[PDB]
Design a protein around this ligand. Structure first.
Ligand SMILES: CCCCCCCCCCCCCCCCCC(=O)OC[C@H](COP(=O)([O-])OCC(O)COP(=O)([O-])OC[C@@H](COC(=O)CCCCCCCCCCCCCCCCC)OC(=O)CCCCCCCCCCCCCCCCC)OC(=O)CCCCCCCCCCCCCCCCC
Ligand SMILES: CCCCCCCCCCCCCCCCCC(=O)OC[C@H](COP(=O)([O-])OCC(O)COP(=O)([O-])OC[C@@H](COC(=O)CCCCCCCCCCCCCCCCC)OC(=O)CCCCCCCCCCCCCCCCC)OC(=O)CCCCCCCCCCCCCCCCC
Ligand SMILES: CCCCCCCCCCCCCCCC(=O)OC[C@H](COP(=O)(O)OCCN)OC(=O)CCCCCCCCCCCCCCC
Lengths: 87, 57
């Protein structure tokens, strides 16, 4: 094959092009030994509460302002083309 | 155990006993692995386990 390909930043398994690692022990269990639906509700509720309390206003402010100007624009546009608006 | 007893116990073994033991112990059962060194190319647990049970049969 060969063909002398170019330069990338991914590689493949075995040589992923990353810095050399040392002294990183990792443990994991088997899917048949662990239990799904264990601590899901508690952790999910805590994460959702933290995310709502943390991000929050970032979304709350622009959407609220946009909705307010939407309502005001609809009301004013309906008023102006009515009888009393044109006068 | 005397060598006569060992010979008798080994003689009883047939291919069907091997098949039964391999089906009740090896065929699609949990494994415990342990790796040391440069193991970047060693895939994760589920992909490793998937190879212990052939799908053709
Ligand atoms: C327009 C689009 C806008 C949004 C676009 C992006 C949205 C992405 C799509 C979401 C879909 C995926 C998803 O969240 O659900 C998959 C999610 C699995 O994903 P995961 O690995 O847990 O990771 C997501 C976590 O939520 C990790 O997140 P977390 O830890 O921050 O937790 C957040 C938590 C939010 O926290 C809560 O709401 C508190 C927990 C109450 C659960 C609410 C529903 C149950 O989210 C949930 O757990 C939601 C559960 C179901 C979502 C409903 C899908 C609606 C789609 C929206 C459109 O499914 C479940 O958790 C379902 C649990 C129960 C199912 C099993 C039922 C038993 C067996 C059935 C037998 C009957 C026969
Ligand atoms: C009907 C089901 C046929 C699906 C083929 C299959 O069962 O896998 C090959 C597998 C051959 O491997 P084996 O020697 O039986 O040992 C199984 C090992 O666990 C070997 O398992 P593995 O961990 O190496 O996983 C192989 C599996 C990877 O896992 C998947 O199922 C891949 C899913 C990707 C898309 C789903 C389609 O790949 C396949 O399922 C074969 C290629 C999938 C579709 C190829 C697309 C283009 C060709 C048309 O089964 C056969 O071809 C024998 C007949 C089985 C059903 C017919
Ligand atoms: C395009 C799809 C439209 C139709 C959708 C309906 C399809 C019906 C599928 C039925 C559920 C899957 C049962 C298999 C469970 C299983 O056997 O999992 C085993 C395998 C591997 O696990 P393992 O052997 O290593 O486990 C080891 C055990 N010790 O997992 C899978 O291969 C997952 C395959 C799920 C189906 C593929 C879905 C992704 C395709 C869409 C995304 C790409 C879109 C491309 C454009 C179309």
């Amino acid at each position: 094959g060969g063909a002398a390909g170019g330069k990338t930043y991914l590689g493949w398994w075995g040589h992923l092009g990353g810095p050399k690692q040392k002294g990183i022990i990792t443990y994991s269990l088997s899917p048949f030994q662990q239990r799904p639906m264990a601590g899901f509700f508690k952790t999910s509720t805590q994460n959702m509460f933290r995310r709502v309390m943390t991000e929050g206003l970032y979304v709350a402010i622009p959407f609220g302002i946009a909705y307010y100007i939407y309502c005001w624009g609809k009301e004013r546009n309906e008023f102006l083309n009515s009888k009393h608006g044109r006068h | 155990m005397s060598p006569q007893e060992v010979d008798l116990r080994i003689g009883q073994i047939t291919e069907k006993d091997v098949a039964r033991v391999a089906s009740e112990m090896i065929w699609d059962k949990d494994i415990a692995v342990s790796a040391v060194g440069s193991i970047e190319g060693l895939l994760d647990y589920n992909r490793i386990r998937s190879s212990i049970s052939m799908n053709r049969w």
